[PDB]
Amino acid sequence: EPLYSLRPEHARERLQDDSVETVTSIEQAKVEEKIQEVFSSYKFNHLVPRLVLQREKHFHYLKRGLRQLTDAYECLDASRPWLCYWILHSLELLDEPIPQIVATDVCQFLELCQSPDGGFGGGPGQYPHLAPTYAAVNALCIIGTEEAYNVINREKLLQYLYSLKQPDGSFLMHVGGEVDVRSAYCAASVASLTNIITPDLFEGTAEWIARCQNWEGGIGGVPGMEAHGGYTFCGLAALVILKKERSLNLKSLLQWVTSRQMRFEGGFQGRCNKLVDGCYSFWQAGLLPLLHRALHAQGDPALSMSHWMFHQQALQEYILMCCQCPAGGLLDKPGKSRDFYHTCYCLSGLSIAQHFGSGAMLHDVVMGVPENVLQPTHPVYNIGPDKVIQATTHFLQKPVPGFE
């Protein structure tokens, strides 16, 4: 009875297809049958459900990956600062120390990824791009040493962000690239952490992000597009950095994200009528601490003083029972292969689900053994709150750069 997903009344949450089968309901029923097999395994094997986060297996997988990867990772040869970030953030969440020599080696590698005209590329000598720029700055802030902060060329990073800024408020992902909401979040994230925000760098950006909120309440990658969890996280997190959350309809956004939690699986889907996926444990659930903060700022008196506005227990049960690989690492759903991307965002979502905080109120929900408790993560940057304060404090001692 302690587990919400195993209660007999939970069987009522299975899909009701109204006797009208389409590709969407057939695929949803397939996932629910597989997820029910996982939930029933304890009753079938005659064991007490013992939800354990396999920290040791996760740590071994991560420490090896931080050094070396097989040719199976050739598809991430233009995403190596992302691998630094996903692995260091997973280790930070697991409270696993980063040795000083390993930290120096990461700094030296990200220096090779930095472009002479600002920003970082997906690997040594690659052209800069806002996504590896975001990942590299987050990785360097997780390290948080004077050496790590000194890697960033702030003067050139500012020049680079301006070269991507468009008159409509949006940002290109890279020179000769395209625009989407992620670019605005990448730019707002690195610019606020390094204290390089000039008065007009984000002119029109909040209004451009608001044009991406659609009829569903969520946000699409560009205006006109379907609401999607990853882009909605990017949109709202960028507006929180800019202090412009009121540009969105926060009530239609709140109703949309809460609707993305799956009644049966407990995890989150990325879009309406799509499948559950472990990485949306961060992208979707991470929106509720952002909305709580945004609504608290407006003086909302109806907010909870102990829980986020999602079923924290059901999300932890989905991550712990369905998203762990027995050999270490986490995954989208049972039957999928592990990867560092899902390891990072399943653990980030698990940490959001465990820790509520607002004003002077703090309340934890740790499903399973007490050792499952993770270190907290900041919902805007998705690095430890201590690392955000340490980096912001460090760069606030430097002036905002001038122009060449």
Partner: protein
């Protein structure tokens, strides 16, 4: 001559006579590597020769063919894609042959971002969208919810004003899968950019169409969200018949979506000085309790927040 990356007679660039003059440039990962990928011989060979042509900026036919192999090894390498577009213009390459190439690689890797951006650049360069709606319909025939394919479809339709047949295409895909949210989004995208929803006959047609889809598949959330989305702009309380018509469908086509929509109607009624305020508030709070405790327990914190919000706004 040409050699496909996956052909059985593919040879490494270090064994090709027409490449003997250039020295490969190895990747510098530092003396203490991190996140180091142990590349296969084939991958390492292509990229050592790619780094060589990129460093000297060789704008040649052999460099152009080399970018095809580098892309096929890692289609997310945006630096290789940038150099391929520099070579397409410098060498005056036939862009219809490049359209045939991008068609084939998108068919292979339809979820890669770079391939779709490259296709958009070719369409912009040629100023020719004549193959796009048919090509995108082929990708959507394999995965009807591919986010990049829908984004490219919206870009082609807006940029080239190809609005005339999209509502018919939307109707076709809703018949195939009425739960496809990407198609309900495309429906909103077409109507909002052509007639708009301020036209009464269009809004009435859309709400009547959506209510029929709800009657046929009551637990399909997309139709409920579309009904809500097109009426929430003016406010749900501005449509007084909506409440009684949903209460009529409740005893045989009920769901947590119908009950939630009733709370949304009552919330807007309370904000707009409705008749029988105490009765409307009591009905709204009773439904919040039913949703939190039985019909939609996964959203218990949301429904408890809504219930507390209604009490706060009334007091």
């Amino acid at each position: 001559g040409f050699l496909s990356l996956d052909s059985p007679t593919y040879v490494l660039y270090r064994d090709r006579a027409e490449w003997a003059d250039i020295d490969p440039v190895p990747q510098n990962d530092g003396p203490s590597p991190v996140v180091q990928i142990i590349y296969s011989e084939k991958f390492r060979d292509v990229y050592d020769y790619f780094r060589a042509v990129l460093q000297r900026d060789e704008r040649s036919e052999r460099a152009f063919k080399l970018t095809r192999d580098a892309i096929e090894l890692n289609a997310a390498n945006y630096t290789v894609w940038h150099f391929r577009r520099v070579l397409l213009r410098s060498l005056q390459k036939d862009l219809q042959e490049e359209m045939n190439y991008i068609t084939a690689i998108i068919e292979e890797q339809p979820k890669n971002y770079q391939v779709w951006h490259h296709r958009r650049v070719l369409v912009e360069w040629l100023k020719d969208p004549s193959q796009e709606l048919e090509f995108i319909a082929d990708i959507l025939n394999q995965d009807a919810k591919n986010y990049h394919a829908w984004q490219h479809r919206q870009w082609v339709i807006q940029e080239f004003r190809l609005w005339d047949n999209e509502l018919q295409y939307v109707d076709q895909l809703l018949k195939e899968d009425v739960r496809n949210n990407s198609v309900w989004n495309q429906r909103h995208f077409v109507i909002s950019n052509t007639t708009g929803y301020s036209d009464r006959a269009v809004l009435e047609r859309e709400v009547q169409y959506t209510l029929e889809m709800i009657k046929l598949v009551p637990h399909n959330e997309s139709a409920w969200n579309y009904l809500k989305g097109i009426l929430q702009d003016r406010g749900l309380s501005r449509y007084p018949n909506l409440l009684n018509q949903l209460l009529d469908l409740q005893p045989s086509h009920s769901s947590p979506y119908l009950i939630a929509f009733l709370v949304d109607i009552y919330e807007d009624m309370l904000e707009n000085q409705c008749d029988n305020k105490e009765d409307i508030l009591n009905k709204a709070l009773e439904l919040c309790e039913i949703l939190a405790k039985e019909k939609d327990t996964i959203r218990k914190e949301y429904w408890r927040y809504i219930g507390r919000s209604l009490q706060s706004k009334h007091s």
